[PDB]
């Protein structure tokens, strides 16, 4: 059968206002009994080519609407 959608997938405390749920961020390691912390984006301090990702074509300054066939 032709599959629409990848076949692989086929077979409270935070809500409180004014208070902050405790999370294992202070522990510095995961524990199942503590809530998952909210992590801001990480800054390496330098650019790693191995982990670098090329920017999308449209964002490129040289991007042109007309298509050039090479």
């Amino acid at each position: 059968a032709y599959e629409w959608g990848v076949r692989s997938t086929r077979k409270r405390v935070y809500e409180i206002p004014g208070l902050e749920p405790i999370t294992y961020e202070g522990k510095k390691h995961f524990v199942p009994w503590l809530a998952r912390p909210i992590f801001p984006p990480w800054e390496r301090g330098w650019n790693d080519p191995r982990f670098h990702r090329a920017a999308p074509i449209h964002e490129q300054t040289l991007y042109k609407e007309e298509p050039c066939y090479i």
Partner: protein, 172 residues
């Protein structure tokens, strides 16, 4: 941790280490064409290791794609894929994909889809043919190999002719 073996990023007609990626949505508008009826050529009738029926390479425009072969498909045959619902009976060449509205009652069909756009899921086995039992306005009756007769919209795509190995059901 389970990843399916059918994980090739790009659809290709070349054998893949071999397995050939089949296409069961017969009317997929090809490149450099509008969503209107288009024609294709049966390049070669090859053998599919992963399916009982033999697959026929159908090529049109700038796109080449494998499809299931019907009873009489051979190399060099012409296959038409139409979305338009013909006012009159549309010329029927075995293996062509046409709306059930175009076809007349009694024509053997295969690779039918229960719902429009679902894609071919039944009558894909060797020797399986669906009979168009009845036709009324935008509704048609398609007999699937399970013996289940179902009523579907005329927009559903059906491929004329029986599947290859016509004597599969007669095997002794």
């Amino acid at each position: 941790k389970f990843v399916s073996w059918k994980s090739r990023t790009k659809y290709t007609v070349k054998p893949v280490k071999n397995y050939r990626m089949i296409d069961f949505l017969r009317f997929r508008p090809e490149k450099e064409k509008a969503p209107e009826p288009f024609e294709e050529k049966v390049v070669v009738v090859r053998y599919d290791p992963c399916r009982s029926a033999d697959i026929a390479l159908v090529a049109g425009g700038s796109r080449k794609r494998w499809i299931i072969a019907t009873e009489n498909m051979k190399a060099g045959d012409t296959i038409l894929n139409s979305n338009h619902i013909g006012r009159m009976a549309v010329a029927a060449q075995e293996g062509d994909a046409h709306p059930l509205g175009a076809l007349p009652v009694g024509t053997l069909i295969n690779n039918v889809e229960s719902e429009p756009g679902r894609g071919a899921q039944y009558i894909r086995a060797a020797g399986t043919c669906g009979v168009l039992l009845r036709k009324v306005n935008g509704t048609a009756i398609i007999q699937l190999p399970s013996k289940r007769q179902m009523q579907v919209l005329e927009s559903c795509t059906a491929t004329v002719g029986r599947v290859s190995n016509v004597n599969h059901n007669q095997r002794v």
